[PDB]
Paper text:
Here, using a pseudotype virus entry assay, we found that NeoCoV and its close relative, [name]-2180, can efficiently bind to and use specific bat [name] 2 ([name]) orthologues and, less favourably, human [name] as entry receptors through their receptor-binding domains (RBDs) on the spike (S) proteins. We determined the cryo-electron microscopy (cryo-EM) structures of the [name]-2180 spike trimer as well as of the NeoCoV and [name]-2180 RBDs bound to [name] [name], revealing a binding mode that is distinct from that observed for SARS-[name]-2 and NL63. Cryo-electron microscopy analysis revealed an [name]–[name] binding interface involving protein–glycan interactions, distinct from those of other known [name]-using coronaviruses. Our structural analysis indicates that NeoCoV and [name]-2180 bind to an apical side surface of [name], which is largely different from the surface engaged by other [name]-using coronaviruses.
To determine the molecular basis of [name] recognition, we performed structural studies of Bat37ACE2 in a complex with the NeoCoV and [name]-2180 RBDs. 3D classification revealed that the NeoCoV [name]–Bat37ACE2 complex primarily adopts a dimeric state with two copies of [name] bound to two RBDs, whereas only a monomeric state was observed in the [name]-2180–Bat37ACE2 complex. We determined the structures of these two complexes at a resolution of 3.8 Å, and C2 symmetry expansion was performed for the NeoCoV [name]–Bat37ACE2 complex to further improve the resolution to 3.5 Å, enabling a reliable analysis of the interactions involved in binding. Despite existing in different oligomeric states, the structures revealed that both NeoCoV and [name]-2180 recognize Bat37ACE2 in a very similar manner. The [name]-2180 RBM contains a T510F substitution relative to NeoCoV, which further improves hydrophobic interactions with Bat37ACE2 and is consistent with the increased binding affinity observed for this NeoCoV point mutant. The [name]-2180 spike equivalent residue is Phe511, which is consistent with its slightly higher affinity for hACE2. Using biolayer interferometry (BLI), we found that the NeoCoV and [name]-2180 RBDs bound with the highest avidity to [name] ([name]) [name] (apparent binding affinity (KD,app) = 1.98 nM for NeoCoV and KD,app = 1.29 nM for [name]-2180), whereas hACE2 binding was below the detection limit. Although Bat37ACE2 is not the best receptor for supporting pseudotype entry, probably due to its moderate association rate (kon) with the RBDs of the two viruses, the observed dissociation rate (koff) is very slow, rendering it ideal for virus neutralization and cryo-EM analysis.
Residue numbers in the entry:
A (entry chain A): 21 to 615
B (entry chain B): 387 to 413, 416 to 428, 431 to 480, 483 to 584
Write the structure that this text describes.
């Protein structure tokens, strides 16, 4: 009778959890759209009510052991609740870990770097990021990059070192080998037949993807190097790695700001629809209404009346201050909202659809039990939104919406510029994500001595992404922690996963749509078969293993890079013609070793 | 034509301004009874005489010093959420002596902000049209300090704020009378 009692328990939990979730989500939404000292405390108190509830219910959940229960639906919901987390640690260790997390976050957020050649000038991180994405001055770029690492990396290293040990002890308390293993568990699923995925299997598939994407990256790297070598003459070897501070990114994650240096065809113009929208007198209302039609044309869900009346879709003129950053909200009780400050710009024409795509997924699994109201994997949540975003960006859609001339067509030079711009955001970001996630995993696992944490980080970076730091760090430095998602407790594999899933989903939906052509020309709208198939997967949430949810679209059990390589197939061929024998890089090169 | 109500005790606010249409009646005296400070398409001397299809006058309390943005070309809050004067059918600023029953009791206010829906659309006044009731109701329930409050009317969320001009109290006060004359031929029912 354990399962029967567990079922009654979960139904009671889910009912109260929804009511408390609504109060907290609403208080948070109201605060973000109305910043007042009166709303501030209000939101927290609402959050605490849910938290106190969740922990009391956690203790109750542990009265229903998973070994005795046979129904997988019940086991999954209880498994979510039956987690001690930090409550495996003593009061001193629990409080100490919380203190360290707050401290590391603060050091990053309030960090600044001052100009070594003029003490009068100093910039906060926001100003330093602005320099990295814009400046072409080798010197300015160098002192801001170096300074950031010295100013925060040397304050966080000690905190992160103690943070690691404490996170590992916590994970042991929760029956994991280490904290890396704890995070790997987010991909672990229990089930029968072939629908079973292990924590160690995650590592193996990740290595496999890296090797499959690797040759596309090697072609992109040689091309980018060949062009940056002229932009920064005598600073980069014909064969070798790229300087970290010249990647257009403070942390070397994205290469998108290099597009202007690495553009395939300089004489060609890109497509910018902003001018058309202004001439046609578009509003924010037009952008969102068209976003709804896009999804109706795909064959998914309409928006509710509450969505249109309550969401904050544009910045107010009232005088109240608001938070501007695109977020999809789910307040419970079928209350779905999008928060953003929409302008009549081509970028927002893609963002509105992206956020709308998050809502489409959130609505789809609304029929699931409270605890299972999530994506099959965090990678699915984001990957689905991105696939829909690409479908909208595709010129065929823009023509359909009346945003392009009927006499407009693309040549094979335009396609190359488009694909490379995409590659700088999609391909150049992958071996980075892989490298950094793997390094931390080894740190938490305990495969690297503390004194060697830094040395392994840069050796991996030279071999995996081909990026080098111009001035050596003795060891006291902790460069990884200079990034938001390392100083704070965040995982990066989801981003590696998000990208691969995006392409697996895009390709699968294209064949259903019967698109006889390249994936960068393929759209998903006006194919209700593709819409229905996508509906079926989105609806599942966490009631099924992500391997099941993946199979429902891509007919596979695991991650697969082939769809990505397919998308960029014509780019790959062009890059070969440009790169010749320069493909790949020498990991033995470093600016410091030049003299 | 009976104009008693134009200089009567119950001076209105703009948010709830008053108007009276005159027809089939005989209308200089109105200008003699009050003290005029200024005159602003039709020449006021041409307005003062002749036969009209209809004559419609609206009036409300309003500081003389604020006349700068009551005029056409203004995009002030005093135009869009307050009073949008129509100009399709071709404005006297005056003060009223305490010797004339002009009680001017209560508080005199106006709407500064009023919008709704997910796009924060401004519920602006049509020419010759009062502020929307949703705007009026939100303003009545506003703190009067200018803080914007949330209201919900018919299920539709609104944002509204109110301010006053009840500090501008002189014995003569400050009032504005706007006379619009419809000169359409074939009617001519309002004559001197
Ligand atoms: C941005 O965030 C702020 C902070 O929360 C919001 O401010 C609140 O707005 C609500 C209205 O939405 C206010 O509620 C009303 O309070 C009136 C009483 O005001 C006096 O007393 C309060 C203390 O309780 C003082 O703070 C205030 O200064 C006054 O001295 C009530 O009379 C109102 O009653 C109405 O609603 C009830 C509903 O049950 C009906 O029964 C009544 O008949 C009547 O219709 C109402 O309760 C609230 O007091 C404001 N808080 C503060 C601190 O001032 C902003 O509205 C929000 N802005 C936006 C755009 O979201
Ligand atoms: C959370 O921690 C408690 C201990 O504070 C765990 O309960 C113990 O489990 C062991 C192993 O089965 C038993 O020998 C002890 O007698 C239990 N103690 C109590 C007070 O029940 C609990 O299992 C942990 N829960 C999870 C999900 O890790
Ligand atoms: C790449 O070059 C383009 C110009 O072709 C830059 O676009 C300009 O950006 C500024 C803002 O800094 C705008 O004020 C201009 O109006 C833009 N010009 C055009 C024609 O749109 C673009 O910013 C450059 N990329 C980078 C990373 O610097
Ligand atoms: C883009 O397409 C054009 C047109 O097909 C290609 O240019 C042709 O290349 C062949 C092979 O050398 C020549 O015989 C033709 O005379 C060329 N036509 C013109 C108008 O120049 C071009 O090479 C293609 N570019 C890429 C990168 O594939
Ligand atoms: C598991 O529980 C669900 C209700 O949450 C029920 O519909 C399903 O039939 C049960 N499965 C088995 C095998 O009992
Ligand atoms: C979908 O079909 C409609 C006609 O019903 C057409 O107007 C629209 O442009 C098509 N969508 C695309 C992306 O071509
Ligand atoms: C108002 O009162 C003053 C002072 O007695 C007087 O001079 C003026 O003529 C009066 N104006 C009107 C319109 O009655
Ligand atoms: C807003 O919601 C109400 C129901 O409360 C509905 O009648 C109205 O049509 C909706 N308005 C819009 C613009 O969606």
């Amino acid at each position: 009778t354990t399962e029967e009692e567990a079922r009654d328990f979960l139904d009671k939990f889910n009912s109260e959890a929804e009511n408390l979730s609504h109060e907290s989500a609403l208080a948070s939404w109201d605060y973000n759209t109305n910043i007042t000292d009166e709303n501030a405390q209000k939101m927290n108190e609402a959050d605490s009510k849910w938290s106190d509830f969740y922990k009391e219910q956690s203790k109750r959940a542990q009265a229903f052991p998973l070994q005795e229960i046979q129904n997988l639906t019940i086991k999954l919901q209880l498994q979510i609740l039956q987690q001690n987390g930090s409550s495996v640690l003593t009061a001193e260790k629990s409080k100490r870990l919380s203190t360290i997390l707050t401290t590391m976050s603060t050091i990053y957020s309030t960090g600044k770097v001052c100009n070594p050649n003029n003490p009068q000038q100093c910039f906060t991180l926001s100003g330093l990021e602005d320099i990295m994405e814009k400046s072409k001055d080798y010197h300015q770029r160098l002192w801001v990059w170096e300074g950031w690492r010295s100013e925060v990396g040397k304050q966080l290293r000690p905190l992160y070192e103690e943070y690691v040990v404490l996170k590992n002890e916590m994970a042991r308390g929760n029956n994991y080998e280490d904290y890396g293993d704890y995070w790997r568990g987010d991909y672990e699923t229990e089930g029968e037949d072939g629908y079973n995925y292990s924590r160690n299997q995650l590592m193996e598939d990740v290595d496999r993807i890296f090797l499959e994407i690797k040759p596309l990256y090697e072609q992109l790297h040689a091309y980018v190097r060949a062009k940056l070598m002229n932009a920064y003459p005598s600073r980069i070897s014909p064969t070798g790695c790229l300087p970290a501070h010249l990647l257009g990114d403070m942390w070397g994650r994205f290469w998108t700001n290099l597009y202007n240096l690495t553009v395939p065809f300089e004489q060609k113009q890109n497509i910018d629809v902003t001018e058309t929208m202004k001439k046609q007198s578009w509003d924010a209302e037009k952008i969102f209404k068209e976003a709804e039609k896009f999804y109706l044309s795909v064959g998914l869900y309409s928006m509710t009346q509450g969505f249109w009346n309550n969401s904050m879709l544009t910045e107010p003129s009232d005088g109240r201050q608001v938070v501007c950053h695109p977020t999809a909200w789910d307040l419970g009780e079928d209350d779905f909202r999008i928060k953003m400050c929409t302008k009549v710009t081509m970028d927002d024409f893609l963002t509105a659809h992206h956020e709308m795509g998050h809502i489409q997924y959130d609505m789809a699994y609304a029929k699931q039990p409270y605890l299972l109201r999530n994506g099959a994997n965090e990678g699915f949540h984001e990957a689905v939104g991105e696939v829909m975003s690409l479908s909208v960006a595709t010129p065929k859609h823009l023509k359909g919406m009346g945003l392009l001339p009927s006499d407009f067509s693309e040549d094979n030079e335009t396609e190359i510029n488009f694909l490379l711009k995409q590659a700088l955001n999609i391909v150049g970001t992958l071996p980075f994500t892989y490298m950094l996630e793997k390094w931390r995993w080894m740190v938490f696992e305990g495969k690297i001595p503390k004194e060697q944490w830094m040395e392994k980080w840069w050796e991996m970076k030279r071999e995996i992404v081909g990026v080098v730091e111009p001035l050596p760090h003795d060891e006291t430095y902790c460069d990884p922690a200079s990034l938001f998602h390392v100083a704070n407790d965040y995982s990066f594999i989801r981003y590696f996963t998000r990208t691969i899933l995006e392409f697996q989903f895009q390709e699968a939906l294209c064949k259903i749509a019967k698109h006889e052509g390249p994936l960068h020309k393929c759209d998903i709208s006006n194919s209700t078969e593709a819409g229905k198939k996508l509906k079926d997967m989105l609806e599942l949430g966490k009631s099924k293993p992500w391997t099941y949810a993946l199979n429902q679209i891509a007919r596979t059990k695991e991650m697969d890079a082939k769809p990505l390589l397919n998308y960029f197939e014509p780019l790959f061929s062009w890059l070969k013609k440009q790169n010749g024998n320069s493909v790949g890089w020498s990991a033995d090169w470093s600016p410091y070793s030049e003299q | 034509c009976n104009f008693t109500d134009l200089f009567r005790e119950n001076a209105p606010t703009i948010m709830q301004y008053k108007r009276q249409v005159f027809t089939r009646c005989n209308y200089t005296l109105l200008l003699s009874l009050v003290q005029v400070d200024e005159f602003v398409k039709i020449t006021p001397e041409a307005l003062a005489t002749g036969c009209y299809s209809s004559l419609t006058v609206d009036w409300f309390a309003f500081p003389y010093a604020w006349k700068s943005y009551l005029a056409i070309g203004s995009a002030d809050r005093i135009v869009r959420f307050n009073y949008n004067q129509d100009y399709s059918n071709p404005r006297i600023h005056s003060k009223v002596n305490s010797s004339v029953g002009i009680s001017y009791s209560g508080l005199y206010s106006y709407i500064t902000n009023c919008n709704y829906g997910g796009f924060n659309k401004d519920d602006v006044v049509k020419p010759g049209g009062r502020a929307s009731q949703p705007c009026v109701t939100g303003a009545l329930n506003s703190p009067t300090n200018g803080q914007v409050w949330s209201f919900n009317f018919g299920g539709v969320p609104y944002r509204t704020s109110r301010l006053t001009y009840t500090d501008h109290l002189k014995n003569p006060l400050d009032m504005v009378y706007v006379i619009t004359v419809k000169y359409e031929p074939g009617a001519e029912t309002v004559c001197p």
